[PDB]
């Protein structure tokens with residue numbers, strides 16, 4: 001038939017269940033509602049089994065594990081892991097071209113008149129990369145994993161999310177080829193070797209190369225552009241990429257929403273505890 | 275006798291991780307000679323350390339400390355959790371952090387109803403209680419993450435380790451002291467003092483506060499679960515272990531990287 005679960009039913013099923021409910025079709029409302037009742041019980045049973053398993057076998061958190069898996073792969077390739085402050089300045093945002101008129105500006109959480117929660121890692125990474133160039137003539141390769149914040153409103157969007165951002169200044173070889181190779185290192189280390197690279201428009205970067213899995217963006221990457229590099233006193237080929245770690249984990253683990261695999265007081269590693 | 279001047283101490287600590295406050299000199303000329311030499315050594319040592327990190331990169335020192343402690347706690351039966359940085363005003367109020375408490379004035383507000391967490395306890399206690407709804411046995415969990423406080427060994431953003439144990443125990447104080455030992459040994463700081471609630475100090479500097487039975491976290495229930503917990507400042511632990519001359523060098527920064535100044 002053509003009858004689907006209602007939007008409310010889909011939300012109720014996804015609360016405790018990680019099935020693919022949006023695909024189901026039914027002949028009529030009675031059959032839809034009977035199937036909903038059955039699948040709500042399955043979802044709750046499966047959820048409880050997962051919680052009992054985590055209690056019986058304590059483990060590192062799934063998001064922490066993914067971070068460690070990727071970070072170890074990048075260190076093995078000669079990337080320095082950095083940690084930078086969550087607070088950044090209004091000026092730092094302006095140097096990314098994120099000023100009052102831009103849409104991303106409206107998504108920023110301000111702490112005071114001059115400081116904000118970072119919505120991206122690039123401002124701090126540009127700073128650190130430029131300073132590291134003072135200490136070497138070779139490539140400068142760094143990465144950070146940490147929380148970024150944006151006002152949002154819900155598909156694959158969190159207000160606090162974990163970005164992995166990498167930067168490579170002065171790469172040996174063509175900057176685009178080098179960028180594609182480091183994307184490959186990350187994706188394989190994350191357990192997601194199958195993905196598409198797709199050119200997309202960008203307010204900040206003009207054009208990005210995005211990593212998409214079945215049409216879902218999990219990363220944006222860019223070489224420069226020159227104006228952005230020069231705004232950070234960078235005067236050589238440069239590239240970087242930013243990955244959404246909860247998005248990666250959600251896709252790999254087949255969680256039905258993006259809210260289950262990261263930080264939460266309701267979910268733990270895909271299962272709802274309350 | 276003369277010591278390094280206050281300005282000389284600050285200048286030496288900018289690039290250097292020596293212990294400069296103890297040095298004594300016979301006269302200004304010898305102080306100034308020693309200062310010039312120690313400044314030069316600190317700067318060259320710093321440059322070499324940065325060149326070594328570029329040449330042979332490693333996991334960040336703070337990330338490594340988190341992993342070392344986390345490994346040890348999971349081996350002891352603790353579940354790792356991650357909770358949001360944002361918490362509600364009501365959650366703080368249930369913490370007893372109300373408009374009158376001095377910590378309240380240290381809170382970074384995001385809007386009228388939400389703040390950056392100044393500690394991990396409110397979220398950790400909530401998660402422990404919910405996990406206890408799913409088992410008959412005790413629940414032991416930990417989190418490591420950023421907390422935020424307006425401040426004057428203090429950082430505005432710092433990394434807390436918080437661990438908790440809820441449910442049937444038996445000699446809760448000795449069990450809590452053992453969890454402290456597990457963390458401190460895994461961090462590479464086996465020598466410390468317990469002080470009085472229990473505080474952990476190294477040479478007089480607080481690095482952890484711990485408690486049995488903080489039933490104030492649970493005003494919503496008449497009957498409480500037994501519980502204990504402990505909170506550690508990870509930058510403080512790393513600074514002490516690595517002998518960095520300030521607390522600003524081992525954690526998150528755009529001027530320091532693993533103890534060394536990059537600008």
Ligand SMILES: Nc1ncnc2c1ncn2[C@@H]1O[C@H](COP(=O)(O)OP(=O)(O)NP(=O)(O)O)[C@@H](O)[C@H]1O
Nearest residue numbers: 150152156157158161217218219220242243244247
């Ligand atoms: N609110 C969010 N929640 C979770 N992940 C996010 C969020 N915003 C961005 N990301 C991730 O961070 C990566 C780099 O950020 P960025 O390129 O600025 O995202 P974006 O273009 O705003 N993505 P989108 O909002 O889906 O169109 C993205 O590719 C996502 O994987």
Ligand SMILES: Nc1ncnc2c1ncn2[C@@H]1O[C@H](COP(=O)(O)OP(=O)(O)NP(=O)(O)O)[C@@H](O)[C@H]1O
Nearest residue numbers: 423425427428429432480481482483505506507510
């Ligand atoms: N601003 C800060 N910067 C770094 N570490 C901190 C900070 N505040 C607290 N900590 C650490 O977090 C642990 C638990 O927090 P808490 O018990 O609230 O600290 P506290 O009593 O305010 N300590 P203090 O401010 O040194 O007197 C402390 O023992 C410290 O190791």
Ligand SMILES: [NH3+][C@@H](Cc1ccc2[nH]c3ccccc3c(=O)c2c1)C(=O)O
Nearest residue numbers: 120122125126165167220222240241242
């Ligand atoms: N568009 C997303 C993802 C993205 C794209 C290109 C980037 N290029 C860089 C170059 C140098 C240093 C850091 C970066 C950086 O993080 C970066 C991040 C965002 O920024 O949120």
Ligand SMILES: [Mg+2]
Nearest residue numbers: 107150152157
């Ligand atoms: Mg967006």
Ligand SMILES: [Mg+2]
Nearest residue numbers: 200210217220
């Ligand atoms: Mg996009």
Ligand SMILES: [Mg+2]
Nearest residue numbers: 208217219220
């Ligand atoms: Mg994008």
Ligand SMILES: [Mg+2]
Nearest residue numbers: 380423425428
């Ligand atoms: Mg204090």
Ligand SMILES: [Mg+2]
Nearest residue numbers: 473480482483
């Ligand atoms: Mg204290």
